[PDB]
Design a protein around this ligand. Structure first.
Ligand SMILES: [Cl-]
Ligand SMILES: [Cl-]
Ligand code: NA
Length: 129
């Protein structure tokens, strides 16, 4: 599913991401935009052979099992394919574990490089939340 900007803001808010660990909703929407262009089916392969899955491009090296990333952890205890669902619940619940692990949203390279220090509230401007 490809989300609209406000549709995804609303879904993330309902799933408890607004101000989760102090990150306002605009941060999460901005990260989703540049990680996946709001497409839950996005996948990208990494140089180390791991793969990034879903709207928040969660990596199979640490967070999910895709059956082809040798020696990887599965810290969200989910198959990586569950992260590609039109239902964002699994991606959100895993992202909450990621953002709580010490490095906050810096775990998402695109957030650090394209959202951090910008006016992220602009990503939810106009939405009825
Ligand atoms: Cl915001
Ligand atoms: Cl980047
Ligand atoms: Na959803």
């Amino acid at each position: 599913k490809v989300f609209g900007r406000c549709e995804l803001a609303a879904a993330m808010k309902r799933h408890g991401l607004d101000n989760y660990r102090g990150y306002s909703l605009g941060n999460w929407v901005c990260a989703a935009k540049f990680e996946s262009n709001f497409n839950t089916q996005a996948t990208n392969r990494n140089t180390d052979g791991s793969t990034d899955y879903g709207i928040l491009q969660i990596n199979s090296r640490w967070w999910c099992n895709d059956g082809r990333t040798p020696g990887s952890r599965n810290l969200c205890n989910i198959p990586c394919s569950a992260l590609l669902s039109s239902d964002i619940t699994a991606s959100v619940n895993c992202a909450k574990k990621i953002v709580s692990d010490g490095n906050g949203m810096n775990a998402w390279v695109a957030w650090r490089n394209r959202c951090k220090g910008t006016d992220v509230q602009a990503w939810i401007r106009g939405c009825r939340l």
